[PDB]
UniProtKB/Swiss-Prot annotation, chain A:
Residues 1-305 are cytoplasmic. It catalyses: TSAVLQ-|-SGFRK-NH2 and SGVTFQ-|-GKFKK the two peptides corresponding to the two self-cleavage sites of the SARS 3C-like proteinase are the two most reactive peptide substrates. The enzyme exhibits a strong preference for substrates containing Gln at P1 position and Leu at P2 position. There is a cross-link at K5, K90 (Glycyl lysine isopeptide (Lys-Gly) (interchain with G-Cter in ubiquitin)). This is 3C-like proteinase nsp5. It comes from Severe acute respiratory syndrome coronavirus 2. Inhibited by pyridone-containing alpha-ketoamides compounds 13a and 13b. In turn, alpha-ketoamide 13b (tert-butyl (1-((S)-1-(((S)-4-(benzylamino)-3,4-dioxo-1-((S)-2-oxopyrrolidin-3-yl)butan-2-yl)amino)-3-cyclopropyl-1-oxopropan-2-yl)-2-oxo-1,2-dihydropyridin-3-yl)carbamate) inhibits SARS-CoV-2 replication in human lung cells. Inhibited ex vivo by michael acceptor inhibitor N3. Inhibited ex vivo by compound 11a and 11b. It comes from the Viruses. The chain holds residues 3264 to 3568 of 7096 of the full protein. 3CL-PRO exists as monomer and homodimer. Only the homodimer shows catalytic activity. Interacts with host FBXO22; this interaction promotes the proteasomal degradation of nsp5. The active site is at H41 (for 3cl-pro activity), C145 (nucleophile). It is found in: Host cytoplasm; Host Golgi apparatus; Host nucleus. Residues 1-305 form the Peptidase C30 domain. Coiled coil: none annotated. Cleaves the C-terminus of replicase polyprotein at 11 sites. Recognizes substrates containing the core sequence [ILMVF]-Q-|-[SGACN]. Cleaves and inactivates human TRMT1, preventing tRNA guanine(26)-dimethylation of tRNAs. May cleave human NLRP1 in lung epithelial cells, thereby activating the NLRP1 inflammasome pathway. May cleave human GSDMD, triggering alternative GSDME-mediated epithelial cell death upon activation of the NLRP1 inflammasome, which may enhance the release interleukins 1B, 6, 16 and 18. Also able to bind an ADP-ribose-1''-phosphate (ADRP).
Amino acid sequence: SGFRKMAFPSGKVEGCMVQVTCGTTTLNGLWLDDVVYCPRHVICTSEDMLNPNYEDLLIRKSNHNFLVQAGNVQLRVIGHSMQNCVLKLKVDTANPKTPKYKFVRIQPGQTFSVLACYNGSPSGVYQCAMRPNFTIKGSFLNGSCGSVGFNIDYDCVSFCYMHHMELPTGVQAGTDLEGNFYGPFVDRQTAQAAGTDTTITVNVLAWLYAAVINGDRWFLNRFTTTLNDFNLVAMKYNYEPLTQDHVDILGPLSAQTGIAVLDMCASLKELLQNGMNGRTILGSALLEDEFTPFDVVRQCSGVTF
Amino acid sequence: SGFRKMAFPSGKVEGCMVQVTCGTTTLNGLWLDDVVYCPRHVICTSEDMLNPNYEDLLIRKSNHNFLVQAGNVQLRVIGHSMQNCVLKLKVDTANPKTPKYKFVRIQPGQTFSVLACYNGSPSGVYQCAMRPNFTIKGSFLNGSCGSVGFNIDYDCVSFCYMHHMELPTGVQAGTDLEGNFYGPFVDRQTAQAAGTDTTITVNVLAWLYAAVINGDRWFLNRFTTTLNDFNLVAMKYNYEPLTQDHVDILGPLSAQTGIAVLDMCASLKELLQNGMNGRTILGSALLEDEFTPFDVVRQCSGVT
């Protein structure tokens, strides 16, 4: 028993992290086969970042402007190109540690592991959720850019995130590995509005089920509710509306615990309306929304890789 | 900016995890050089765990009774021995993925990363603290036994923990890599007293400094205090007494923030006495004590 925010083992990704330097700027790159992926803003100076014409800036750059380092080994850049907001640096050597991988665009409310790096060296690993407003509440200092997010499905590493920037509000924004930003954000140093950040309702419920499975059941009430009536209450507290798809996803957890989803919703309703009265659930004094139903199942069944 | 509970990259440890089987029992082992380390209770059945004579049980066993599997590769066991509560199985092949490593016995209140495994395969990774009462609040299912805890200092992996059991209270107990239990716990299925779990005061303070560094400053009051007077308040709320060594450790964070340690103590004093009034600090509604001062510095300076 016990329940923790848990990241995927990072070994397969560690072997793909490199250092990319262009001028003064140094950040992280992902080395898969004979290609290094990094944020395209590596080519910019602090001034350029205000209003960069990336096409024009990229034209001025040559292969020899890009210093790519894997540990102590220096890779030879034999070509460079731009796919949306990601730079693809072609190198002469294929990464022999390249794992079975895919690029996926993940949905808001889904989770992934982030391998935080600095100068191409892995620093740490932690589990993140893509917020409904397409930001991430991560931990990123200067030179953390190009650190990637991933899931591991059996043998396959599914890269889903690359960090590009911190917004003035102190949250992070990034792209998928095809270089399309999550949300409305762009890779320029201007004021960008993050939207209203709602709570991921389906995740909170999954966490409540995890609580029950681990013998934390104090919040279980006698009441039930309907989807409609629950969502009325959810809207008030800036919770994602709950759909039947969401209800369906929770089925396995419902079946394990013997607690119907709508009964759990009624428990959640009371917690939102009355608070926790200074109690905890799984050692937390607020409702956690960064565990998916699949995360809870994964942890409670003990799936390995 | 931003501040997260962060584990060390697990790659170097993943290459050392193996499956150890003895009879019906299967659990995890640590393969370093030509030696495999695992919990000695691998030799026990469910019945035996009530009151095991490990010496006697071990006598019945021979080298060939220990099945050691690394991925698909089966290792040949050429010797076995018992060191405290750990089994040391000598194998014919040195682990070619053996990193630079050390065995360390960590102090209560220090942190480490745990690589949770099942049947010798890595499942996940998370950051833990050794509680003052020598337990850990982890996440361990059946067959998670032998999963290890570690720190990484530049190139060197410092193994500090091996999981042995869950206590009836739902927390975990284990040993260092020489097989000595942290705290008073033993490897038998009996009721064992966990003891009062105090809060790691120096860690809470480090976290408060991290909060300030990330611009979360609402809890900063006008008051100050003394060590003695603070500790009087600490004792009341089951907080570890704060020492001058603790004060000294916080110096870099004090210097970065411009907030004297005793001023921070006074802020903490008010939070203990008045609560948080339903507010948060770094996205948490309670005081976090599983970040060391080193952890905070590591994250805020961006060490690899």
